Every structure is written in structure tokens, then in C-alpha cells.
Ligand binder design. Structure first.
Ligand SMILES: CCCCCCCCCCCCCCCC(=O)O
Length: 127
């Protein structure tokens, strides 16, 4: 349902966010303009997602409504719960970051908010 492969079209406030969260500037620099790929496999409430940005491949999984460990941008793994807010929307919060992922047709919009910082990503189905 969320299942598919998607690639980044555009994003806002990437570096603000990534510095604030602790990403090595050596990585935030080379990452600014990468159009990353997301491969998602949803099976009921079971989700697997791989996010590929260059040589950095992060793979995660979670079951909706359960506790799950998620590997973060920095490599830090956090224990949280991901919830559905409608079949088309994934919502979680970790390290004071609120992440919203919403699929509309072939476009996935992801929003992460740390304080006043709103990091938004817009991706498009590919393969
Ligand atoms: C590496 C950061 C982990 C993100 C934590 C969000 C948990 C739900 C995410 C499900 C798949 C995310 C959608 C990918 C779209 C995108 O790359 O912006």
C-alpha cells in the first residue's frame, strides 16, 4: 500500500535539520543535493524500508503500534512506536522530532519537525 520504490524530487531545510541533529558536516555537505531512493514493503502492519543516499544505505523495519528500533540519520538507533493515522499516513516521534510520512497517489511527502525547524521531503514513485 505504501509499498513501492520512490525517489526524492525536492526538500527544504536539509542542512539546518541535519546539523541540529548531529550529522557530520562532512556528510551534510555531500548529501544536500542527493536525490535519495526509498524502497518500502508494507505487509499489513509490517513495514520494511531501505533508504539509499549515495553510499549510505539505511535499512529499517517496524510493526505499526508496536515498539520498534529505528536507525537514525546519524546511525543512532532509537526505540519508538510508529502509528497509522489513516491507511496513508505514518506518524512517529523520536528525539523530540515529529516525523509524518504521507502517501498521496505516487507522491510521498515526509515531514520532520525539530522545534521551529521543518524538514520536508517530497518523493515520487519510480521503478
Ligand atoms: C532514517 C530516518 C528514519 C525515519 C523514521 C520514520 C519511520 C516511518 C518511515 C517509513 C518510510 C519513510 C518514507 C521514506 C520517504 C523519504 O525518504 O522521505
Amino acid at each position: 500500500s505504501f509499498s513501492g520504490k520512490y525517489q526524492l524530487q525536492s526538500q527544504e531545510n536539509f542542512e539546518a535539520f541535519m546539523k541540529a541533529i548531529g550529522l557530520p558536516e562532512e556528510l551534510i555537505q555531500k548529501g544536500k543535493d542527493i536525490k535519495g531512493v526509498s524502497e518500502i514493503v508494507q505487509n499489513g502492519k509490517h513495514f520494511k524500508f531501505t533508504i539509499t543516499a549515495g553510499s549510505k544505505v539505511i535499512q529499517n523495519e517496524f510493526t505499526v503500534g508496536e515498539e520498534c528500533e529505528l536507525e537514525t540519520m546519524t546511525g543512532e538507533k532509537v526505540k519508538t512506536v510508529v502509528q497509522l493515522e489513516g491507511d496513508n499516513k505514518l506518524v512517529t516521534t523520536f528525539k523530540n522530532i515529529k516525523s509524518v510520512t504521507e502517501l498521496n497517489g505516487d507522491i510521498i511527502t515526509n515531514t520532520m519537525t525539530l522545534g521551529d525547524i521543518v524538514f520536508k521531503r517530497i518523493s515520487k514513485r519510480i521503478g
